[PDB]
Amino acid sequence: ESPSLLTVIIEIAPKLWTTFDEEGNEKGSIIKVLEALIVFLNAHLAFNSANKVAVIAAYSQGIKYLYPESTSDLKIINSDMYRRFRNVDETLVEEIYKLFELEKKQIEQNSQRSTLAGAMSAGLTYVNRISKESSLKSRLLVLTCGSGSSKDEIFQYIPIMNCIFSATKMKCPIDVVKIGGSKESTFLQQTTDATNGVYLHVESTEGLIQYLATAMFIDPSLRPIIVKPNHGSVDFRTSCYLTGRVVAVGFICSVCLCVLSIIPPGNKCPACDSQFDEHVIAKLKRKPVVPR
Amino acid sequence: SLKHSVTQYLEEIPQQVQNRLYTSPATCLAIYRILPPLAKFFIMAMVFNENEVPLLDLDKWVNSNGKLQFQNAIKSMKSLHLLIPNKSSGTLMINLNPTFKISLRNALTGGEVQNSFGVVVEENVVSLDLLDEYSANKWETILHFMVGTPLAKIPSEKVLNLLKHSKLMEEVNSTGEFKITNEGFQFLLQEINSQLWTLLLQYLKMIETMDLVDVLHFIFMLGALEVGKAYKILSETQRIMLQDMRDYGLVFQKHSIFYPTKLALMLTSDTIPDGSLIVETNFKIYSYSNSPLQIAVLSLFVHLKARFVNMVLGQITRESIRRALTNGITADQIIAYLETHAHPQMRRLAEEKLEKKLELDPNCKEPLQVLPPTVVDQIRLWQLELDRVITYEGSLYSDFETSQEYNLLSKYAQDIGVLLWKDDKKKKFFISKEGNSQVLDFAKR
Amino acid sequence: DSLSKEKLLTNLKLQQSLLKGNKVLMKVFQETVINAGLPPSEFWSTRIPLLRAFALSTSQKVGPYNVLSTIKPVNKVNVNLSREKILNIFENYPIVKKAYTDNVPKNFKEPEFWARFFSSKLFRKLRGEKIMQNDRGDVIIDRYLTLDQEFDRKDDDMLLHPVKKIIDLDGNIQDDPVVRGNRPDFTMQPGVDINGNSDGTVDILKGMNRLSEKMIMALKNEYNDERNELKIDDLNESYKTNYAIIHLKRNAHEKTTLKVSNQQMLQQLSLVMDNLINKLDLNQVVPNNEVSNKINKRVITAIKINAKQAKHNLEVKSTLPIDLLESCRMLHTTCCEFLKHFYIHFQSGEQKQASTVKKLYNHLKDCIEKLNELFQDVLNGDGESMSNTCTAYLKPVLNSITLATHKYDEYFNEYNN
Amino acid sequence: MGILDEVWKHKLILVETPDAQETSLALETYRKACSNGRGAILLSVARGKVSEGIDFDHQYGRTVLMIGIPFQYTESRILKARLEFMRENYRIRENDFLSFDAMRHAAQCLGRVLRGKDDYGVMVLADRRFSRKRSQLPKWIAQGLSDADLNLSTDMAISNTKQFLRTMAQPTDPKDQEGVSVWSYEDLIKHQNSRK
Amino acid sequence: ASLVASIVEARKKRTAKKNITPYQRGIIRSLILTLDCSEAMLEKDLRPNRHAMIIQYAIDFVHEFFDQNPISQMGIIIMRNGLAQLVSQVSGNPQDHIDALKSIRKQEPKGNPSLQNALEMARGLLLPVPAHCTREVLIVFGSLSTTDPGDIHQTIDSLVSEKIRVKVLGLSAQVAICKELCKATNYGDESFYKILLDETHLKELFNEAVTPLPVNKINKGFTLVKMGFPTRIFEDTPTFCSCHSKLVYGGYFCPNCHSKVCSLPTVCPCCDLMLILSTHLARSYHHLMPLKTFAEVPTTEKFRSEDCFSCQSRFPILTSSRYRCEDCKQEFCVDCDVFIHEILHNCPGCESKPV
């Protein structure tokens, strides 16, 4: 039908990749992933002649517009392959080596924040840019190494929600590929379910070629005539603000609107300092009255 | 019907000849480009595992909403002999063509290509200045030759013979002149890759043993080729028709190094606007387009006035209309050009009028013509007033009896495609002279 | 007024009115109280906003307007009377209402009356038409002329009121009671006819002024300050919003219900940069077709599972007998109504609610037994051919109902036991 | 003609009664009608009792239909004797003095619209002969009287009035008038120093 | 010379948006749009007529209001022929009011308005409304007058006493009584009686009315509210729903009383408790966390970068179009500034910059 603007974000982080390859033994698994993605973009740009690809990597200190080159020469790959495929693959391996050399250079400083949401947002802006230029399908791909330490998704939660709402406005499914020890990533699973995206988690770096060639090929040209393969289901619930556990039925502030599994101490808001009404909370604490 | 015509031709190509075509990765890449999305997905899934599948697994995977499209994809898949579906263990065991499979695999991996993507010399030069200019020159010469406006640079004698034999732009030997057939105007209406594909289909049809699969593989890799580089001059049949398509201006060859122009790229794939025309009830032309080719083709069916930078003006006359009509050029062809040359403001006004008339009545009691009938139906009324009769000439069988027999004989002619007209109420029908003998034999039996 | 919960429950006539308005409300109410015998106050206790909305919809009335000015004279004339406008004329002109009520129920017909009315000069007088002795009017309607005149006098007497001195033109002209000048112009004074009498334009102008005054006093119905009046707001301070901003302190609890080292990650990083600059092969990515076959098995299993999920993608089409379908829908509906009312009683939390809770518990038990007996009926009507589907269709409301019963029993054992 | 019946459908109509008391009740009615916003129209003589001490503002002073030149009654021997005496005394042109008095009565009629600078209003001149009298007219009045406005018809009068209403229906930034129209104490100080 | 006019227009525009505040703004909303369908809106004076455009704009308003703020109920009462007619009760489903408005499409606007009756029955409809819900009414009006049965000032006093605000979008010009309503209801503010100048301005006004409004400190109602996240099931068997009493394949399940529903964000029909998703509550967090404006750096000074930080394009070169996020110290293009300030609700420069 139409050229599908391909959007691929690769979450590269040595804190995750070192953790994964030390947990297992597949050194160069990230290289295997990169080669698989090279074949994936080849299969995509051979599926359609103009389904243009946006490739962005988010490193530890920030993000990088990988494909294409900025608005401001060895060949590792073979010379017998296709021209456009070779140009893209050579450009990406050059950009990847430059980013990895940079990452080796500035390895020793510490930044504990994931940049996945910012990378996703910048990619969505570029999707707006491409779609506003000249009619193009929007499909967003994330590659993550989930074997790293799940430190704090709490600050990541809000912009991820904002990105979900934006992609909902933009009819862009958010398809998730996870490689890690943890089977489940709740926010990503919720993201896939809300955006009609595809969630998938495995561990072995082998067979990802067949995995994301078979499953991760759904385009908006043929989305309604393809069943989604996701098996997990999400309650769309959140952990409590002061006890950190998910709540089924509970309480939220009339002002801050944060989930309270229990009564806040001092009857004041733990988010926006609103003192509440004692008769209200006593009625909330009321037991039912039962006949003797 | 370009993919339909090529797929039909390859289905006409036998199974092992198809398998010979499926040997090389460049041919497999071009054919994969031809395949529809469902079959494309199927083969890219199965190409990386040597696990044959039964049809039941694919059927369970397939959502039934697009099951007709799935049927089309697998019908093409089987009829191209790209599949080997056998009822193994009672189940229709699905198997891709293995030569196609491995050649696609090597093309995707960048593995063994045997320079099917091209025997490369890689002496790149500028193409906009030599290749594009010579290409535009030669294509301009053949295009104005095909227009009929006078031009000195005649085409090759091979293509001249192909035009003489073919029903495209008839070089009528009684007149000694190339003459616009209705098929010639179809070619004029065609897209550029459509014109190239019609030309190569006709040349492949006329050419015989010159190895047909050599021409096929060479055509597929020539489509697969890239612009602006020198390459090694391969099969000799491929080389001599390569020199032929050099004389067509497709490649810029320095008699061994050859430099393929942009025409190979357009043959491979496609790449208040230009070509947008404002219609007028006064038949005035407000074209947002200009070329000497545009004037040359507008000379056939439009009375023009002058040439300016984008502003080509004129007035469509009924003399111009009937000049188009008397060439055998179809009014449907004319409105094909017209409806491919519409303008934004007028089509927005037409859609506003359509949405206004939608709420009043579904039929609107108006003729079905979306382009504004104030100007557009004036041609369409002239289109209906052009033909406006039905002529039947030759044999005719009359005064049938039993209606039975009349329906039987008439139905039989329709089945064999020799029936030209019938009337239940008079129990009469007309059949072509070719089918006369067949109908008579059936009547006796 | 008619706005309390007691008033809305009291208005049985209005309750019957929107009852008769709906049809599923006869169905529901009939099952609720005619069939199940629920307290109809508690029936209407849920539908209180609906009752008040119906009341307020029925309760509004229009504002006054110049109905005689909207009357047009329209050869011949055909009466095209509108009853709402006839009552508008009645309300605007009680004299015309009186002239209707003492003549039509006594002497002649309504359309004959209105033809006489349009013929009458009293109609012209009450409208913006100057009376003329050339017009004959209608004698029966024009007998009310002096009655309308003394109505006008009484109404003007009513309309008289004292005036503020801040705007009192009478005080303004009573500034100097001994002004001795010259007689003002005939042009700019109220002109008269030849014989000194007026034409009556002052009468028609004071009449339309009386119409305006009657308007504004109809507005002014049952349903010092000059300091505020003379304020010059243009030289005053601009109003500023007292809207409160909000901050947000941020301290979230961690999610509740081995550690890597820089040396080791640096060693691996050095090694993988070495591998990166060393080599990269696309061709090695092809799997072993056996672990890949297990991947095929996993993928196809996921496809089968989610396809069976998608296989069950007006209500659904069903092969029920239509009567039993309606009966089971009805039973589901009244069970839902019972359950909602029982929850209303339970979440209320009073000792006054106790007998209500007990009785609704009994009703829920009765509904359970009736569901079971219905299951016996579809049992011996189907041989459990699709009586299984009947049981499963009525299942989840039954599960919620019996869960509520268990909750009631548990809280009974909590408090009493 | 029954035009007043059409006028009934939009606003009330109030006429200057010869009784000042009924006129007072009438103006109270107009006041309350513009108070509730249902709208009303006053009909008063140019020299009539309303015109000499009653102001109208921000809904009361919004638009005025001045009807023609308010010339005095021409055939007054009293007026003619006045004209003769004042011409004999101060060499006064009689027609010019008549235009002066008409003039000044019209200004008295039209001066009761703008109470504060926040108010706004539109003025009409419903006579052909007014066009020669802008030089007569008061300076601040005529400074808003543009040269295109000297001879207008109903259509562009309506269009300009609608656009004026659209214009006056907008808020205004205080920065554009904080030093040129409205003055603070510091603004007056700065102006006084600038005078110094 | 058009760029100088554009620059001074942008300056006079940005003078209003210089002050950006984190006011407490209402989330539990209660919005009523009454419609008049009278003889005034029969004017074709704006194309095609006022009735058609207010229908279309109300469709858009319903969509935008339910998208941005799904945590409110919407009621519509039409005004026609001296009567105010309720056509849409307050509900969580926008589609009901969409269908009611589609019924309003084909019927004919005629009559005269009565804001007294309209606001009175709007008050009565707004009467059984909980405390946290912010009762506010949008009123469209085309007349310059209002026929009424009785006093409006008693209604004004009652509405002020019952803590309901109004905002009037008049058509022709200002009406003094509507100004009085807006001022007295709105604590003396004049920022609520708004008059359009064209249909584009009407569109902008409707978009402005979409947004939540700030609340007052004196109008203090700071409390908690009980909430419950339900669970969605995907069952093989169709099942009867509690709300519409019909067979449903799927449906959420009640967290408290374990019944099932058909739509969200809705309250329970059985345990009678509100059920939402965390997406719904996080939907207004841009209102809860506003975004600072981005400053163009001047063309005279030296520049940190010459191409856009976010969209990655070259900055064009008289003036300098480098909108700087001072919170992240990065300059951006106008397109990215628009997208981040309106569509997005995060600054990726501040996402990359660690705190």
Ligand SMILES: [Zn+2]
């Ligand atoms: Zn809070």
Ligand SMILES: [Zn+2]
């Ligand atoms: Zn339902």
Ligand SMILES: [Zn+2]
């Ligand atoms: Zn519940």
Ligand SMILES: [Zn+2]
């Ligand atoms: Zn940018």
Ligand SMILES: [Zn+2]
């Ligand atoms: Zn920033």
